């Protein structure tokens, strides 16, 4: 029967699996056992769909004898299917076994070759990202433990409305409180508050066990809701030290973790590109452009040659080609394109009559001219040369749709279809002549040439989303139905809704709000109930990983291809054209300031925001008189030395700010109020008087010059999508407070609202016709709504508000249109993913081609320079072999090999014992673990005082690791000493022993040490983000921070501008992108400000501030990331198979034990074991040392030394030159003169090394 396994069976089975997938798509879940007829038919169909697979699996086993992989997966799903069918038929378990129906499409996808190839590539790229998966696992442990020690159950009190126990009556957001003698949020006015409260968010988010605090740390690492946890641990424990946790976790675990991932991925992509460029795949596209380029001019030359004549086109063709390409024709077609985009853009909601008439009349008035232009350009270049151009076909489709829309104009449907927008791609005609437009054509060229691979990757990602949506609706289908009044729309009811929810979780936005619903639906916080968070965690991790692997591989590969194609094709432009002649022609003062200016900056930072009269703003009110005169005196001393450069103008302006703001008088409500803000230019004075700062600033400005093209393209697409969305949601996003009214006229007066859906507590509210927070009435409003969508903040609300829109000036209808989610999906895919990852890839490839473009073409490729420099900087190390007999014994006991395993397990059980402190622990449990902790302290002390007598009291302090362990130990015994009696601080050191255990491992140490040395190598890139934070903190503090701390808005006791640290925290929260739009709304003008300050408070500057800050912060962080990545790029792409510094390090570590001191004196017989202990890659394998290896080692000319006086550098260089780059005899002087040409100075230290 192994003859029907041919094509028909394969395609038949693929069709069966596809039909099974669609059957699962339809299935739809119902709350609590309900079902319609479709579910009563699909359960019948999924018996034939099981018999087919059973028949398939029955023949293969007795035909092929299960170990093929995907065959095994098919077998598991089949056997689970039969077991499920038997159980369902015999029981009248359903949840358990209908889940394998999502494993079924996996077996589907493992039938297509070029999807299996893509998955293999993804899995091969996943392998290097395992150390940076271990370090992310050993941070959510070290910080979970710390959270266990600090916030164990401290967040269980809440206001209770003293007058009876009742049930937590305190606003519609129960928040922790304190006992006054405590340090949290007092309920103040009455309302005494007592323990016995589930938790801040139903008990799912709290530091109680090692499970609820190994999820709270994960949420604060994915940055989606870390401020909400910070506030909950803030107003429950105090506001003094809860930030050193929640900011040191995100500047160590969410940026220095997202940095390594990007670096490794970029390195792997570059390495793969270099490995794939050798086959010559770039040549085919390289030869494709010229073959296409040299066709149009060949054809039109042939075309116009026929027109010159040897039937009466003596006035047609002459004014056909020389009139559509006659300059003015173009430059006026551009004018008409601008007219069309103005016509379509100049529309809003509730337009005037004249605008509606004119923008409707001009449509066809321009369409007729452009349709004529079609033909006028058609018979000029003919049909072949017209249709060959890809961009010509774009305008072809645009005009076709324009003359086509007068059929569906009868019943709107597409409305005035947003096709008139898409014509502004012909406004890039003006862009045509702009700098590097012949890379934008190359951009789309590459993105369309690699379209097959792009589509395969996108299809694999889409299949992943589909599978995790089917499983999502199987798990949480019809279970998000609680008695709570609201009807949360992030459910898993249908397939479109499940897809939208999965897409929302995949982009991170509110991924922790669906997780809480999933946990509360499957029981609650418990052992079996709180296990469904695994679904969301795996979804997030895998989705983000695949998003990176798709949208960054596409960007990096295609953009590097385009850049290389440009730099290799426009290069020959000169060598071909310019040869037109070839045929024919043939510090004290600087300190004295850098101190004063920065101290003035910190003086202007620590002011009093909210108060206009105080002592801090009087000490710092009259502080600036020493500064202002000495700052002005610098100009006076320097002015007469000359008679003007650039930064001196900035100096003049920053000093004239004080020179004028001292006086002004008169109108003391303005002008002083802008020069008060204009004092944020004092720090910028230091940019000129400090070298290196100019270097980094100029680098950033040249980066602006490089990425202006991408920025302009992104903003043009923003304008385009805003224009399409205007004709789609123009005024349809209105709603009333009462859902029973759907008209502004009807939505008036009062109506009854019931508290918490209780019919016995009616409260009168007014009726208000309120527009959405982010509407689409005009182009400008859509430009902000789409920006907020692209920031992945608040976009689900916009999606589920626009879904309910049906008609203009009418109320919403539940799920009126679900196909409108495609607009947001396409916008997120194209702008929020493609055009941002293309930005990042452009920066990465630009920084990678710069630098190493130094062209160190003194031969000596990029391994031997490092090998030679390491050979030069080398010496035998120190071993410290102890004397005095018994000291050698103690050192041997310490320096044993299997005692290290004992020392590692004594830490492994220490962390496990420490990480069991739950809440409400049995009294005996605490003391039982306390004595165990004391025993661990005793045993570790024993180890330290055993190492002291072994390594001598000197070497115990040399290695930082032993010093670090000593510091940890001595801070552990005195904790036991104070246990007889601050305390919270001293319980913490054991996590440092844990992080040492983390540090164990060669790969972890190499990666981390290299990245830290790279970060230290560039300290002038962090003093750009620091400057930005300083300037915007001061600006926002002076402008927007005077408002009252109203707990009902997004400005409260924790989020405000009323102090510099709090302003910095607010800017940090906006930088991480938590609620920046909400803070911008809260900074809108008309908010009542503090009564202590003498509703006019607020400003309209909020939009500019909170948009410019976000964009600039993103740019600066990306610049820092790319700088630190490209400083270590040499390590990132190394091909460890070839010789590397690690081999030399291990060679040195083996060699050092044979020399009591550094010296350089060796023995002659140690070579016998040296040739055996060298690694087979570095040296020789398992061959006998007394062989050709020794023969060639002695054959070469060693330096003229004694039997054993050869130095370490000489033999190391001999080994490295025999391993790689072998040369014939007589080339020793060639190496001698080469090492003095490009290599660094030897300082005449190779006198003996010459021979
Ligand atoms: C999605 C891929 C990994 C395949 C599906 C595997 C998962 C989703 C399936 C396979 C085994 C299933 C479990 C098996 C048994 C039961 C016991 C029942 O009283 C509650 C559901 C529960 C606990 C199932 C939940 C879903 C489950 C964990
Ligand atoms: C996401 C896929 C790929 C891998 C992870 C499998 C997930 C879906 C599985 C693994 C463990 C499973 C849980 C194990 C135990 C229980 C308790 C039971 O009373 C209800 C089902 C529930 C809550 C299961 C739900 C499904 C579950 C969370
Ligand atoms: C300010 O707070 C008071 C008391 O909590 C509240 O009544 C009022 O509505 C708040 N105003 C704003 C604008 O938040
Ligand atoms: Ca968010």
């Amino acid at each position: 029967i192994s003859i029907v396994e041919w094509k028909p069976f394969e395609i038949i089975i693929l069709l069966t699996i596809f039909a099974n997938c669609v059957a699962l798509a339809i299935y739809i879940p119902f709350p609590e056992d309900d079902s319609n007829a479709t579910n009563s038919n699909l359960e019948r169909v999924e018996y034939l769909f099981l018999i087919i697979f059973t028949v398939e699996a029955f023949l293969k086993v007795i035909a092929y004898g299960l170990r093929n992989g995907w065959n095994l997966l098919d077998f598991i799903i089949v056997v689970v299917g039969l077991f499920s069918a038997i159980l369902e038929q015999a029981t009248k378990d359903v949840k358990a076994l209908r889940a394998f129906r999502v494993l079924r499409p996996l077996r589907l996808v493992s039938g297509v070759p070029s999807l299996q190839v893509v998955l293999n590539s993804i899995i091969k790229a996943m392998v290097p990202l395992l150390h940076i998966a271990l370090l992310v696992l050993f941070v959510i442990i070290i910080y979970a433990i710390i959270g266990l020690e600090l916030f164990m159950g401290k967040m269980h009190k809440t206001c209770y409305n003293q007058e009876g126990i009742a049930d937590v009556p305190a606003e519609d957001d129960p928040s922790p409180c304190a006992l006054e003698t405590g340090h949290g949020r007092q309920c103040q006015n009455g309302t005494v508050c007592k323990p016995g409260w589930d938790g801040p968010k139903h008990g799912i988010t709290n530091f109680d066990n090692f499970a609820f605090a190994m999820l709270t740390v994960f949420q604060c690492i994915t940055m989606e809701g870390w401020t909400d946890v910070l506030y909950w641990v803030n107003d429950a424990v105090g506001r003094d030290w809860p930030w050193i946790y929640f900011v040191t976790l995100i500047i160590i675990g969410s940026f220095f973790v997202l940095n390594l991932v990007l670096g490794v991925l970029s390195g792997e992509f570059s390495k793969e590109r270099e490995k794939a460029k050798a086959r010559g795949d770039f040549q085919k596209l390289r030869e494709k452009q010229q073959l296409e380029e040299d066709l149009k001019g060949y054809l039109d030359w042939i075309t116009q040659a026929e027109d010159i004549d040897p039937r009466w086109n003596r006035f047609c063709r002459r004014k056909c080609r020389a009139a559509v390409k006659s300059n003015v024709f173009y430059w006026l077609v551009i004018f008409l394109v601008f007219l069309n985009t103005l016509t379509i853009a100049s529309e809003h909601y509730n337009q005037p009559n004249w605008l509606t008439e004119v923008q409707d009349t001009a449509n066809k008035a321009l369409l007729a001219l452009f349709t004529a232009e079609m033909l006028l350009k058609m018979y000029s270049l003919g049909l072949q040369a017209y249709f060959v151009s890809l961009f010509n076909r774009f305008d072809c489709f645009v005009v076709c749709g324009g003359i086509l829309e007068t059929i569906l104009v009868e019943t709107k449907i597409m409305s005035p279809l947003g096709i008139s927008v898409l014509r502004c791609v012909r406004l890039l005609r003006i862009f045509k002549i702009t700098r590097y437009w012949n890379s934008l054509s190359n951009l789309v060229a590459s993105l369309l040439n690699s379209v097959r691979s792009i589509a395969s990757l996108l299809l694999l990602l889409f299949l992943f989303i589909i599978i995790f949506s089917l499983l999502g609706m199987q798990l949480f289908g019809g279970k998000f139905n609680f008695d709570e009044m609201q009807t949360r729309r992030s459910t898993f009811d249908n397939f479109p809704q499940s897809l939208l929810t999965v897409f929302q979780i995949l982009t991170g936005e509110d991924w922790n709000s669906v997780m809480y619903d999933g946990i509360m639906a499957y029981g609650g916080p418990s052992f079996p109930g709180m296990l469904v968070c695994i679904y969301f965690i795996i979804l997030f991790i895998c989705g983000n990983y695949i998003l990176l692997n798709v949208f960054l591989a596409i960007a990096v590969d295609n953009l590097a291809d385009a850049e290389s194609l440009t730099s290799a094709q426009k290069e020959e432009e000169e060598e071909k054209e310019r040869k037109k002649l070839a045929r024919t022609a043939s510090t004290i003062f600087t300190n004295l300031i850098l101190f004063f200016i920065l101290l003035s900056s910190i003086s202007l930072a620590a002011e009093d925001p909210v108060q206009h009269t105080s002592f801090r703003n009087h000490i710092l009110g009259n502080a600036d008189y020493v500064f202002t005169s000495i700052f002005t005196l610098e100009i006076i001393l320097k002015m007469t030395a000359y008679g003007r450069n650039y930064f001196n103008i900035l100096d003049l302006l920053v000093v004239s700010v004080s020179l004028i703001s001292f006086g002004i008088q008169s109108s003391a409500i303005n002008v002083v109020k802008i020069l008060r803000v204009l004092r944020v230019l004092r720090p910028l004075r230091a940019i000129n008087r400090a070298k290196g700062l100019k270097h980094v600033v100029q680098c950033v400005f040249v980066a602006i010059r490089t990425i202006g093209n991408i920025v302009i393209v992104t903003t043009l697409l923003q304008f385009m999508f805003a224009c399409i969305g205007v004709q789609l949601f123009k005024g349809k996003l209105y709603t009333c407070s009462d859902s029973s009214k759907q008209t502004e006229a009807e939505c008036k007066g009062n109506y009854i609202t019931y508290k918490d859906g209780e019919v016995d507590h009616p409260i009168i509210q007014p009726r208000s016709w309120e527009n959405s927070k982010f509407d689409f009435d005009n182009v400008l409003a859509a430009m902000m709504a789409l920006f907020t969508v692209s920031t992945f903040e608040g976009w689900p609300e916009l999606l589920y508000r626009s879904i309910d829109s049906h008609t203009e000036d009418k109320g919403p209808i539940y799920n009126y249109r679900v196909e409108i989610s495609i607009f947001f999906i396409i916008y997120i895919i194209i702008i929020a993913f493609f055009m941002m990852n293309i930005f990042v890839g452009f920066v990465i490839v630009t920084f990678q081609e710069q630098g190493e473009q130094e062209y160190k073409n003194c031969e000596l490729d990029k391994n031997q320079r490092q090998c030679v420099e390491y050979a030069l900087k080398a010496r035998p190390l120190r071993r410290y072999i102890p004397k005095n007999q018994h000291q050698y014994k103690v050192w041997y006991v310490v320096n044993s090999t299997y005692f290290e395993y004992l020392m590692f397990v004594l830490i492994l059980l220490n962390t496990i014992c420490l990480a069991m402190q739950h809440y409400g622990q049995s009294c005996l449990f605490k003391i039982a673990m306390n004595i165990l902790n004391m025993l661990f302290t005793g045993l570790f002390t024993v180890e330290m005082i055993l190492k002291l007598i072994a390594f001598k009291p000197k070497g115990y302090f040399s290695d930082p690791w032993n010093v670090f362990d000593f510091l940890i130990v001595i801070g552990s015994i005195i904790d036991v000493i104070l246990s007889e009696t601050s305390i919270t601080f001293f319980r913490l050191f054991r996590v440092m022993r844990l992080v040492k255990l983390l540090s164990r491992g060669e790969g972890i140490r190499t990666l981390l040490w290299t990245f830290i040395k790279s970060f230290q190598a560039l300290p002038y890139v962090a003093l750009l983000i620091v400057m930005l934070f300083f300037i915007y903190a001061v600006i926002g503090m002076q402008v927007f921070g005077k408002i009252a701390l109203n707990d009902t808005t997004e400005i409260n006791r924790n989020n405000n501008f009323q102090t510099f640290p709090q302003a910095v925290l607010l800017l940090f929260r906006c930088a991480t992108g938590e609620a920046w739009q909400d803070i911008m709304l809260a900074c809108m003008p008309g908010k009542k400000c503090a009564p202590e300050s003498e509703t006019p408070c607020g400003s309209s500057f909020a939009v500019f501030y909170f948009i410019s800050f976000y964009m600039l912060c993103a740019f600066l962080i990306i610049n820092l990331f790319v700088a630190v990545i490209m400083d270590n790029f040499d390590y990132l792409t190394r091909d460890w198979s070839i010789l590397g510094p690690h081999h030399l390090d291990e060679f040195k570590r083996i060699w050092a034990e044979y020399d009591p001191e550094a010296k350089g004196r060796i023995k002659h017989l140690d070579v016998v074991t040296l040739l055996r202990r060298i690694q087979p890659p570095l040296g020789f394998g398992k061959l006998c040392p007394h062989r050709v290896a020794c023969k060639r080692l002695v054959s070469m000319n060693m330096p003229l030394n004694s039997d054993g006086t050869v130095m370490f550098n000489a033999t190391l260089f001999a080994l490295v030159r025999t391993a790689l780059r072998i040369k014939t005899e007589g080339n020793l002087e060639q190496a001698n003169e080469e090492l003095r040409a490009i290599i660094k100075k030897i300082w005449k230290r190779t006198s003996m090394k010459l021979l």
Side-chain angles (χ1 to χ4, degrees), residues 1046 1048-1049 1088:
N1046 210 302
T1048 69
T1049 68
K1088 151 184 148 272

Side-chain angles (χ1 to χ4, degrees), residues 635-692:
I635 300 175
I636 296 165
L637 250 63
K638 193 41 191 149
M639 205 297 294
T640 59
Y642 194 30
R644 276 285 88 173
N645 58 292
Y646 295 149
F647 274 100
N648 289 22
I649 313 155
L650 185 44
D651 178 18
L652 295 167
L653 181 70
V654 303
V655 86
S656 90
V657 162
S658 95
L659 286 164
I660 270 168
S661 202
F662 202 9
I664 291 191
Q665 46 256 44
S666 169
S667 160
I669 56 149
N670 328 296
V671 63
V672 200
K673 268 68 175 149
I674 52 152
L675 259 56
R676 169 161 73 164
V677 169
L678 213 63
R679 294 185 345 267
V680 295
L681 327 167
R682 314 204 218 165
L684 310 154
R685 171 169 207 201
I687 313 187
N688 179 84
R689 319 210 76 72
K691 65 105 181 181

Side-chain angles (χ1 to χ4, degrees), residues 220-339:
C220 298
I221 273 176
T222 80
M223 280 159 9
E224 191 68 24
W226 78 278
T227 60
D228 282 34
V229 179
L230 179 49
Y231 300 160
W232 287 337
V233 198
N234 239 331
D235 57 71
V237 200
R239 208 168 272 116
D240 173 43
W241 59 248
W243 58 275
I244 288 154
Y245 184 90
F246 288 99
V247 76
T248 313
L249 166 79
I250 318 191
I251 73 151
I252 276 176
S254 180
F255 281 156
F256 188 65
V257 160
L258 156 74
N259 180 186
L260 316 186
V261 162
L262 258 52
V264 161
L265 266 157
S266 167
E268 195 38 11
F269 287 168
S270 149
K271 211 158 67 202
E272 206 284 330
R273 262 194 61 259
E274 296 325 278
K275 297 195 171 23
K277 201 181 269 334
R279 72 211 294 211
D281 217 16
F282 164 68
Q283 309 314 303
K284 273 132 196 53
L285 169 64
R286 169 65 201 287
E287 266 54 75
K288 181 148 89 136
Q289 300 304 136
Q290 27 191 4
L291 219 74
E292 192 40 74
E293 276 171 343
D294 79 330
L295 165 77
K296 43 107 188 187
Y298 273 10
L299 250 56
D300 83 335
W301 175 13
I302 265 62
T303 297
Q304 62 192 280
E306 178 149 63
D307 314 342
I308 327 286
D309 319 327
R311 69 139 306 193
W312 216 93
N313 39 52
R314 332 187 212 199
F315 281 100
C316 164
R317 292 302 208 279
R318 286 136 177 73
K319 286 96 175 170
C320 209
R321 293 161 310 90
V324 303
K325 295 184 330 291
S326 68
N327 188 86
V328 188
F329 184 102
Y330 192 27
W331 215 347
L332 164 149
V333 158
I334 296 316
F335 174 65
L336 261 304
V337 158
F338 145 78
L339 255 62

